[PDB]
Design a protein around this ligand. Structure first.
Ligand SMILES: Nc1ncnc2c1ncn2[C@@H]1O[C@H](COP(=O)(O)OP(=O)(O)OC[C@H]2O[C@H](O)[C@H](O)[C@@H]2O)[C@@H](O)[C@H]1O
Ligand SMILES: [Mg+2]
Length: 221
């Protein structure tokens, strides 16, 4: 049943999919690149501002090729963004995840998005910070983004959105997590910028929005 639904959905156009959406959606063309958002506006010595967006809101509304889930090792769901993604995708998402046998910290696995306007969900498991991030934490978080981007490339995905992985109940401090997310995407884009149209940082909390906004230029402009 999940296999059948998956094969059916992946054959459909946006136009067809939009007729069965259970919720409202945000089209990719309504999301400004960083380059456009700054249009209304020294240091020692690639422009990548066309390739990235900072977006505040519910990731499950985004009509993009893939959204990324801040999952746990079981891949079976939970709270926070994981819970939101499972509710919005419907029970076929859990069914496909039950066929996957979990996921390691810093790895990623890809599934169909089912009821989501997103074509795919890329599930990744962030590191857990219980008071400090001086173990493998920083590299583990970077690995989440790298592993997700590997699947982006392998699955011909041209638009992808990331939530603030690990900064919820997994407790990673917000500023260092943002530095890692931005640096990882920057480094990947230097080599792969023709591979995608947009990478969207979907922040949820005002705190993360403020952090990301102060850092976008130092990374991409
Ligand atoms: N609808 C949403 N859209 C975008 N971002 C969201 C949304 N809802 C929450 N966030 C943000 O998503 C970000 C991440 O917060 P968290 O969801 O706790 O994920 P973690 O990686 O720290 O913890 C993983 C565990 O949580 C789950 O139970 C899993 O099953 C795992 O067991 C925060 O910035 C949220 O504000
Ligand atoms: Mg490609």
């Amino acid at each position: 049943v999940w296999r059948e639904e998956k094969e059916r959905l992946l054959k459909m156009t946006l136009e067809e999919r939009r007729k069965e959406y259970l919720r409202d959606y945000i089209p990719l063309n309504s999301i400004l690149s960083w380059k456009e958002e700054m249009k209304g506006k020294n240091t020692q010595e690639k422009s990548l501002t066309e390739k990235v967006s900072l977006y505040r809101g519910d990731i499950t509304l985004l009509e993009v090729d893939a959204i990324v889930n801040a999952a746990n090792a079981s891949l079976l769901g939970g709270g926070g963004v994981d819970g939101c993604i499972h509710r919005a995708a419907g029970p076929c998402l859990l069914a496909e995840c039950r066929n996957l046998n979990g996921c390691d910290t810093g790895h990623a696995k890809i599934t169909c998005g089912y009821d989501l306007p997103a074509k795919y969900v890329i599930h990744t498991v962030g590191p857990i910070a219980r008071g400090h991030i001086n173990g493998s934490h920083k590299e583990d978080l970077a690995n989440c983004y790298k592993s997700s981007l590997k699947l982006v490339k392998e699955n011909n995905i041209r638009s992808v959105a990331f939530p603030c992985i690990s900064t919820g109940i997994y407790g990673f401090p917000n500023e260092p997590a943002a530095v890692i997310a931005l640096n990882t995407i920057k480094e990947w884009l230097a080599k792969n910028h023709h591979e995608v149209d947009r990478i969207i940082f979907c922040v949820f909390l005002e705190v993360d929005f403020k952090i990301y906004k102060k850092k976008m230029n130092e990374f991409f402009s």
